[PDB]
Design a protein around this ligand. Structure first.
Ligand SMILES: *[C@H](C)[C@H]1/C(=C/c2[nH]c(/C=C3N=C(/C=C4\NC(=O)C(CC)=C4C)C(C)=C\3CCC(=O)O)c(CCC(=O)O)c2C)NC(=O)[C@@H]1C
Ligand SMILES: *[C@H](C)[C@H]1/C(=C/c2[nH]c(/C=C3N=C(/C=C4\NC(=O)C(CC)=C4C)C(C)=C\3CCC(=O)O)c(CCC(=O)O)c2C)NC(=O)[C@@H]1C
Ligand SMILES: *[C@H](C)[C@H]1/C(=C/c2[nH]c(/C=C3N=C(/C=C4\NC(=O)C(CC)=C4C)C(C)=C\3CCC(=O)O)c(CCC(=O)O)c2C)NC(=O)[C@@H]1C
Ligand SMILES: CCC1=C(C)/C(=C/C2=NC(=C\c3[nH]c(/C=C4\NC(=O)[C@H](C)[C@H]4CC)c(C)c3CCC(=O)O)/C(CCC(=O)O)=C2C)NC1=O
Ligand SMILES: CC1=C(/C=C/C(C)=C/C=C/C(C)=C/C=C/C=C(C)/C=C/C=C(C)/C=C/C2=C(C)C(=O)CCC2(C)C)C(C)(C)CCC1=O
Lengths: 67, 300, 161, 57, 160, 161, 160, 160, 161, 160
């Protein structure tokens, strides 16, 4: 299936965490295509900055066989 | 545990029934002789296939037991008497029980356990059963041994063994030494075995000196008392041979060679202790040297 | 959960009292037993699988329980029963270390009887298996530590039955 | 024709009868197919050159 | 069975059965006669397959019946043959059902744990399964045994 | 759950026995009836929404349930009733394909009566709806497939009652 | 490393090293001479301990060296003893570091998969490590033998 | 048992047990050795008792094993012997319990309906129980024979 | 219900065997304990009212439970709590005599938790009261019979929880 | 009596007495000699036992004999001693009968109502019966005292 490799930086806004938070502060993950929209919406609502997005799996414009 | 055969005719159930028919003495002698025949006419024991850790504590307790009580405990297991060791044995799997008996036989061969009475001969019925077991196959042999030996120990609701076995009625005896017939060294050996060092060391001269292995001589009567009471603690010696001759100042130079079965500075059991006794002319040991002569075994 | 120390401290706190002579004596007794508890725990942790294997062989194997129609028939059910025995042994070790059965009540026995009743697990068979585990652990650990482990395993048996 | 005295002699307790899953059912088959064990291959670890006797590829 | 597996997948997706699933069910229904023939042959000759497979397994891996092996002794050998019989019966159930769900549920899930607790070589068990498969394939016709051996292969792969 | 094949397999397994003649006969019967079940399942899957529509129309439209104050008055309540009907249709189709009613107990009937009693849902009305669903599905599916579908729908109704 | 474990726990709780943890590190570093003496003894006596443990293991489980077994054959026995030496070296690493983590890292994680792929009996490997522990206890003092027994029993339990 | 019966009566009246029940319970508990001994006697002689009782019963009543009889046929005769063993076991249970409640609850409620559905003659069953009682009395001392015959005649009377 | 004798008899019967040595040992143990059980039952019957009185005075009186708004406020509610304690003591004595906690399970526990949940009865406080009853009974009967009574009292508490 | 209670239970079940019930009846018949001995002891020492019991009760609870108490005056003391004698006779009857049924049906049912009507302290009466039990235990043999203690405790509990 189509997968998105996304790198983003999401800062904290409400509390000053005292545990190691770099891993979820700046990270890259492989989110599925069917979840990419909601993941992007979550990152934007949390206030993160989408550093980079790439289509790691599949090819653009695949009418069939995108599974 | 595993399903034990009880009555199916054939050969294995018949052999197990015959073993059960044999009394406690016959069964115990038969299992001992079967262990003796193991590896040549019977299957070789493979204790790694059984959880011997469960019986490890009982084995160590038996090993620490004195030979009389060792034989008493083994005969209690044979008679299915009510003892804590019998309970522990009965609470084991058949493989664990068989491995435990194999370890007992191995320790008896190595001398750590009181051996069978010397010159014992297997009864006719037990010998016939053992011959049948030898004729049996390897798997058949192990199945027969397991089924025969599982019934031992004490289990609630079971009570038999009408014949029973009242067992058979070293340190107390003179230490068997070849070429040495001196009361001083004999008393020294007996007292050292008995661990009554306070009475043992009177055989030492007032200027008596002791030479422990790998250490310089220790001089002073109370020094030797301290050495005996802090280093040489509860060790068993088996002197074998010895020679005696005179020496300067009227001394008696006596070289005795024997074996120590107790842990004493390493080389356990397989170290030859040489006692170099420069005894005073009056008799007390002026100089005792204990030399731990070693076999090709090294790392001491 | 509460160990012996926490139990004593809670008993003192409930009455709002400092640790008096009796509480100190109880703490001293627990500290004395601590070495034996640690040794028994290490031995059990080493021989974890062996104890369960021997107990199931002694009490369950070669029976209607393992034969078809028994609760321990399928491989899945055998694995589940072995896992349950492993949990019992581990939590009994926890209870022995802590000197208290609070962990047993809080994380094992809560609803365990209802769980077996709903599942159809034979309570008597499970109790016999735990008894076999107790005997095996006693033989493998010793007298006093074996007795303590038996106390907590019998606590589990009482809760289950 | 049937004789009942024979079966009266041949009566067996019900609880002694073997069920489906009992290995005693296959005990007879195992007896028939006598498996031959392996003769013990006496080997000494002391007389083994670990560095050389281990395979190299 | 295949019916239950298709129903489970369809309900997990929250949908009625697709044309592919329905066609698979109908094809299995049509071909069930050969499956029943396989089950009949296996059940009828089950003593023969178990006997010959045990013989071949003991020959190929004699340490199993050697001293210190798990199957040492008459009782251990009998239990070995009993487990072989369970696996043959499970193979028959899977062949009849057209899916290996019953085999997985009864004698494949947790089999590693059970045999590890019992001290048994899982690879030896897989070898025994392979021996049974060879004997059964010899006992049946080419294509019939050819598609009967698929479940034997599944068991062998899952155990080894 | 379990189909008829699963039931036969489970009975043979629990008795620890190979598939005997009677099990083969039952399997042959299920295989004989399988094509019918596949046809009925295909028909109902093709016409899933429609059958629900006429079931409601013949059963619940312009009635006290759909009036204000009923349990099916509001649009959200109508959607919930439709979802209930679609569950019942889907699971009756599943049971029809599997030849077994175990699925309904596992999924639907295991808590549905308590669910409706907590909700206030009219079980008499839902029984009437499913009873109408019987004939609505039977019309599209035929006579014997209709009989099977009616068997499963009667199962649902009896579980509700 | 006991210090590394303390650092890991302190970082996990997001705190500086506890006074008790620092005291434990201090005591370990003070006793490091005695701790490393055990490793020196094991390294010096690696050959005799490995060979004696292998012989005792073969005595206890003759099936593995019997034909059809994993260790059957001169080369197979050689590589089995080679793995014995590996595990002895790992035990020395653990006793030096004061922590079982190096043992678990190099020679314990994935050991189940490795020996399943090789066909090796993990139970036999555990028994061999037990024999190694017994031999080392014989060759060392009671206190040192008890100290190394912790690492040996850890390896035994992780094996089985 | 008497304990269960007394506790049930006390519960039904919503009261503790009276001393007139407690002393009866004490006497029952004290006099349990003889009941136990009779139990081991019967259980040891179960096979011989069953065989002799069945032989005597079949000699006395030929129609049972005759063509058209309920026990006619091999399996039928074996099943009749099984029923005899069942009732012997129940009698042993009652003897041990010092009460007939276990027998009545286990194999005495609905016995008439069960054997009527089976077609078996309940009178013939009672005759078999009578023969069993005679054999048990022969194998037991005078007092023990009478005590066991109490339960035996209770069973016989309940059967017919 | 079931006593020790009926329990062992049923355990043998369900698997269809005669009474072996192991079961006979259990019956011998029960017969050995019968005298102590009867003495304890007589003592508890003599001191039934006093035991409940002392337990209530030691656990419940002057607490939040008796004050207005508590579950023991009205005189009727106080008498109900006393009656519950009377049940628990009497049935603990029954189970102690029988040597089996089956009468407790089938006449005191099956649904009692549901009844208290409906009525709002504080299960923790009733457990505390039962513990007080256990302590008083132990003090009045002795350690050997006190432990046996406490076994079934704790059984009741665990069933309630 | 135990005999009449057993007969009532058997009639309620609509059956003859079970072997256990018959054994209990026989045991009670055998113990009837000891029961008669205890009754003889009590009836012989009727006067002294009631005298010490009344004196002990008066010392324990002087408020009864104090002004305003129910038993104030020589006539009230005579009535109290008459009640003492009546209850001791009831205890003797119960010991003879082997159960507390005669005691309950003669002077133990409605005792609370009668004392509420008369104003008598029920707790005082219970303490008086307890003093009677203490003096009787001191006066008679331990086994006989132990046997009568159950009946005395039953009476005192019913009066509590
Ligand atoms: C102070 C010397 C300088 C400074 C600080 C500053 N930091 C942030 C935000 C973050 N800092 C970190 C760094 C870490 N997180 C970790 O877990 C670790 C490794 C253990 C490090 C080094 C991160 C990840 C952030 C992101 C936000 C967060 O902390 O979750 C800010 C801005 C915070 C914000 O939300 O705007 C600031 C101001 N600023 C200076 O000018 C100093 C030179
Ligand atoms: C009119 C603007 C559109 C239209 C209407 C139409 N509706 C139906 C049937 C129903 N409509 C409803 C809707 C509601 N019921 C409620 O209680 C609520 C909130 C108060 C709503 C929104 C319902 C429940 C029905 C079912 C009949 C019944 O309630 O008894 C129909 C007839 C459908 C049929 O086939 O019977 C029609 C025609 N049609 C249009 O074309 C307009 C866009
Ligand atoms: C005074 C005229 C008499 C008397 C009183 C007395 N009462 C107690 C203890 C309690 N009294 C009650 C009664 C009630 N609580 C209620 O809620 C109701 C209805 C509203 C009633 C009638 C209770 C529950 C108790 C228990 C203690 C508590 O309140 O929590 C005592 C003390 C008893 C003791 O030993 O603690 C006393 C002294 N005593 C007399 O002699 C007078 C005749
Ligand atoms: C239906 C699914 C299912 C499975 C799989 C199963 C396995 C199974 N095999 C067992 C034992 C056993 N199984 C074997 C068999 C073997 N020995 C070998 O060397 C071979 C590799 C292997 C056979 C090919 C042996 C030897 C035992 C005895 C183990 C012991 O007693 O220690 C046992 C425990 C004893 C008992 O049967 O009661 C179970 C549960 N039971 C089930 O119900
Ligand atoms: C292979 C294999 C195994 C099987 C291993 C096997 C087969 C193990 C079995 C080993 C055997 C046969 C052990 C028997 C030992 C006998 C002893 C100790 C008796 C001594 C008698 C005494 C002291 C009495 C002496 C006497 C005295 C004192 C008297 O007073 C009077 C005379 C008398 C002579 C009686 C395992 C089960 C481990 C695992 C699986 C597996 O494959």
């Amino acid at each position: 299936m189509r997968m998105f490799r996304i790198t983003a930086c999401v800062p904290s806004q409400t509390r000053i965490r005292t545990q190691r938070e770099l891993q979820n502060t700046y990270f890259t993950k492989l989110v599925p295509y069917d979840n990419w929209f909601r993941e992007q919406q979550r990152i934007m609502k949390m206030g993160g900055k989408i550093v980079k997005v790439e289509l790691a799996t599949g090819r653009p414009g695949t009418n069939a066989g995108l599974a | 545990g595993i399903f034990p055969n009880t009555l199916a005719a054939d050969v294995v159930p018949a052999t197990i029934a015959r073993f059960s028919q044999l009394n406690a003495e016959d069964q115990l002698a038969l299992i001992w002789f079967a262990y003796l025949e193991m590896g040549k006419t019977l299957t070789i024991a493979a204790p790694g296939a059984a959880s011997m850790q469960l019986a490890e504590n009982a084995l160590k307790e038996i090993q620490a037991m004195g030979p009389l009580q060792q034989t008493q405990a083994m005969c209690d297991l044979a008679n299915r008497a009510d003892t804590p060791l019998c309970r522990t044995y009965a609470s084991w799997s058949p493989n664990i029980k068989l491995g435990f008996w194999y370890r007992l036989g191995e320790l008896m061969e190595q001398g750590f356990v009181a051996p069978i009475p010397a010159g014992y001969q297997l009864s006719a019925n037990a010998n016939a059963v053992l011959a049948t077991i030898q004729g049996l196959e390897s798997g058949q042999q192990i199945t027969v041994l397991r089924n025969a030996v599982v019934d031992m120990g004490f289990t609630a609701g079971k009570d038999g063994k009408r014949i029973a076995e009242p067992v058979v009625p070293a340190s107390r005896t003179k230490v068997s030494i070849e070429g040495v017939t001196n009361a001083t060294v004999l008393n020294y050996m007996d007292n050292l075995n008995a661990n009554d060092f306070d009475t043992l060391i009177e055989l030492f001269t007032s200027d008596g000196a002791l030479q422990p292995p790998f250490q310089r001589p220790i001089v002073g009567k109370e020094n030797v008392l301290r050495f005996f009471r802090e280093e040489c603690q509860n060790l068993k010696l088996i002197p074998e041979r010895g020679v005696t001759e005179p020496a300067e100042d009227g001394f008696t130079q006596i070289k005795v060679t024997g074996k120590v079965q107790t842990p004493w500075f390493g080389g356990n059991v397989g170290m030859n202790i040489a006692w170099r006794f420069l005894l005073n002319p009056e008799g007390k040991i002026f100089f005792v040297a204990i030399d731990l002569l070693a076999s090709p075994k090294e790392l001491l | 959960m509460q160990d012996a120390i926490t139990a004593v401290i809670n008993s003192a706190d409930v009455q709002g009292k400092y640790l008096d002579g009796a509480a100190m004596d109880k703490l001293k007794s627990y500290f004395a037993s601590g070495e034996l508890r640690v040794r028994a725990a290490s031995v059990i942790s080493a021989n974890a699988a062996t104890i369960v294997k021997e107990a199931v062989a002694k009490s369950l194997l070669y029976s209607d329980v393992t034969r078809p129609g028994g609760n321990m028939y399928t491989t899945r059910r055998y694995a589940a029963c072995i896992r349950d025995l492993d949990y019992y042994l581990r939590y009994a070790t926890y209870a022995m270390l802590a000197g208290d059965a609070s962990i047993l009540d809080e994380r094992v026995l809560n609803g365990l009887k209802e769980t077996y009743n709903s599942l159809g697990v034979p309570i008597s068979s499970t109790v016999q298996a735990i008894q076999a585990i107790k005997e095996v652990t006693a033989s493998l650990v010793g007298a006093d530590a074996g007795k303590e482990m038996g106390v907590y395993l019998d606590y589990i048996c009482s809760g289950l039955s | 024709q049937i004789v009942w005295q024979n079966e009266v002699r041949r009566f067996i307790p019900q609880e002694k009868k073997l069920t489906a899953g009992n290995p005693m059912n296959f005990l007879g088959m195992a007896r028939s197919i006598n498996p031959a064990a392996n003769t013990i291959p006496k080997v000494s670890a002391q007389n083994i050159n670990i560095e050389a006797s281990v395979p190299r590829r | 069975s295949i019916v239950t597996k298709s129903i489970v997948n369809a309900d997990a997706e929250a949908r009625y059965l697709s044309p592919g699933e329905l066609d698979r069910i109908k094809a299995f229904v049509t071909g069930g006669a050969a499956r029943l023939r396989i089950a009949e042959t296996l059940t009828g000759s089950r003593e023969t397959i178990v006997k010959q497979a045990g013989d071949r397994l003991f020959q190929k891996r004699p340490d199993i019946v050697s001293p210190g092996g798990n199957a040492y002794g008459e009782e251990m050998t009998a239990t070995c043959l009993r487990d072989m019989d369970y696996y043959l019966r499970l193979v028959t159930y899977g062949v009849v059902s057209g899916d290996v769900t019953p085999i997985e549920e009864i004698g494949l899930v947790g089999v590693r744990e059970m045999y590890r607790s019992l001290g048994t070589p899982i690879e030896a068990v897989a070898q025994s399964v392979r021996e049974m498969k060879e004997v059964a394939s010899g006992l049946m016709s080419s294509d019939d045994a050819a598609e009967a051996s698929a479940y034997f292969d599944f068991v062998i792969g899952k155990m080894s």
